[PDB]
């Protein structure tokens, strides 16, 4: 059970250590099998579909590396987590070219096992064209 | 003074009625003179600079018209408002072509006059190229 913002931040940090590793075999450790994901106009239902969409992104941006920071994490009485911070990206073929944008993540947790059942990520995708 | 989420939602609705009207002479009714704005990589300081950036947007997309809906509005104990919903845009010359993206707004209020002193807007801008 996540009850404090510090516990929420610790969980989101754990989530993004898995996500930014792109070790898809571990995504199910923190993401529900029935995950509802929204990222702009991109939407997926189910953990497998989310994984396939991420794999497609890594082929659009070959050598993609990502990392994340957060400066404010809120926990609502409904249990939803709002996390405000930044999203970094670069290509392995040119690691000195880093694109960083503000990002907000909204996370709804499963009451049974604490996994993320809904994840909505808000960031401007336009700056990442600079990686090409 | 805003103390309930219902009051926060009522305020944000009034704010976007002003913003989507593009009546810059009234922006100061709800926005602080020292407004700190961030929308992706776009950042401005001061109400006049925010207004000038919006005018530039309306010249990039001649006939730009916008509207907004919200389905969740939260009020933190710090006073900050988080609002999740959608942002719609079209051109007056082709009103049937509507682009709609998810959006979250984060609003910090001035304790003196209740105006927005910091506004952070998160949406993917890439879909709006389809207006051209």
Residue pair B81/B119 in contact (Cβ under 8 Å)? The answer is no
Using a CB-CB distance cutoff of 8 angstroms, which residues of chain B are in contact with residue A127? Answer: 40-41
DSSP one-letter code for A8: H
Resolution in A: 1.7
Work out how many domains chain B is built from and give that number: 1
CATH number at residue B17: 3.10.450.50
Cα separation of A112 and A116, whole Å? 11
Instruction: Burial-class residue A61 by CB neighbours within 10 Å (0-12, 13-18, 19+).
Output: middle
CB of B122 within 8 Å of a chain A CB? The answer is yes
Query: Which one-letter DSSP state was computed for residue A120?
Result: E
Query: Which residues 6+ apart lie within 8 Å of A88 measured at CB?
Result: A66, A67, A68, A69, A98, A99, A100
Suggest the residue from B44, B83, B104 to mutate for an interface test with chain A (most A CBs closer than 10 A): B104
Instruction: Answer whether A124 sits within 8 Å of B41, measured CB to CB.
Output: yes
For A106, the domain range is 5-131
How does B54-69 read in b/e, with b if 16+ C-beta sit within 10 Å? beeeeeebeebebebe
Q: Cα angle at A112 between A106 and A115, to 5 degrees?
A: 40
For residue B80, the chain A residue with the least C-alpha distance is: A74
Report CB contact under 8 Å: B41, A101: yes
Nearest CA in chain B to A78: B74
B99 touches chain A (CB under 8 A): no
Q: What single DSSP character describes residue A30? A: T
C-beta neighbour count of B123 within 10 angstroms: 21
Residue with the two structure tokens 């890594």 = A58
**Interface A-B: count of C-beta contacts within 8 A:** 59
């Amino acid at each position: 059970e996540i009850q404090t913002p510090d516990q929420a931040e610790a969980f989101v940090a754990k989530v993004f250590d898995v996500l930014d590793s792109y070790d898809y075999t571990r995504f199910g450790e923190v993401l529900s099998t029935d995950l509802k994901y929204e990222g702009g106009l991109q939407k997926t239902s189910g953990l497998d579909n989310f994984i396939n969409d991420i794999k497609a992104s890594t082929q659009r941006m070959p050598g993609l590396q990502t990392s994340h920071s957060r400066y404010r994490t809120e926990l609502t009485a409904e249990g939803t987590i709002y996390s405000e911070g930044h999203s970094n990206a670069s290509l392995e073929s040119n690691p000195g070219k880093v694109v960083t944008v503000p990002m907000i993540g909204v996370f709804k947790l499963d009451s049974e096992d604490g996994k993320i059942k809904e994840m909505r990520i808000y960031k401007d995708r336009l700056p990442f064209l600079a990686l090409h």
